[PDB]
Amino acid sequence: PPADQEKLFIQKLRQCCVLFDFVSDPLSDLKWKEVKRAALSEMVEYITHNRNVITEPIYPEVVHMFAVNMFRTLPPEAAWPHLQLVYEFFLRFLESPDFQPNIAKKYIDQKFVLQLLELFDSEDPRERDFLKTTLHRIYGKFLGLRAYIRKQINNIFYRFIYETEHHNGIAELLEILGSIINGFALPLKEEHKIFLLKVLLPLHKVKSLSVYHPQLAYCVVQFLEKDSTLTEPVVMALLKYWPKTHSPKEVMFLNELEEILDVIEPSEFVKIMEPLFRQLAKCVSSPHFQVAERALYYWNNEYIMSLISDNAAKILPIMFPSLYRNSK
């Protein structure tokens, strides 16, 4: 009945929107940073454990407090203790069982998720981890934003492939998409298939592939476990984007290629087995021992030897030409 408990919550949220920086007096600055850090810690534990505290007027105050503190200009950081508490408070706000997306959708709009994506270019890996979790939760709770979030993530990827070729959050964004792909509907819609062929595959061309390669490979494998039909244009694309210059970079392609073979269908294997083992034979005879060791590890794979024993008439003449011939 009395809004004293709700009014104090709104007071402390609005108090955290004061970007004061006292300067001049160092003691007053430390006192201000303390009371803001204390208020944030108080609200974090309050919203996590107390029940029925997220009332309807609380929603616009939380989103405003997050926007005033987080949506800033990225430096080219000593204020991280405050930033981390705001990420934690917002995450506990989204994860609360009392959180109602029907109310927060009025304030978690497209303009909000756009400014949230701009923060993924932060150089701080701790910040990108909080952004990764935050956007993953917004996607899963706001169906009216899922189409927009997928569209804007692609715009960041198209710019990263054909323009700037510089973005520090490529790995975190790909980690989010891996959970969306794992839940894709039965007949993969055309939007998702165009995303695989024209976004995920061209991501192997960028020079900085070594930074987001584990995440990129996971999205490619999950696409083939949903629809095995896409195995042929994926494998042929990796062979196209394969580093013709023998370098340690092609060890990453060998890992992605075995992870694909672990989920490939037999009927889909025979359609690309010849061009694949022709590249694989080039790796087992490569001057770089590190890439030959990784290729020779394919024989240790139990499932891969089964596909070779079933296609020995065509695969063996390619791997060991001095010992096996072929004909009609």
Binding site: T133, I176, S179, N182, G183, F184
Partner: peptide, 10 residues
């Protein structure tokens, strides 16, 4: 943080 699966459609 491994991120749980997000179902496209129920």
């Amino acid at each position: 943080t491994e991120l749980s699966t997000i179902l496209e459609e129920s």
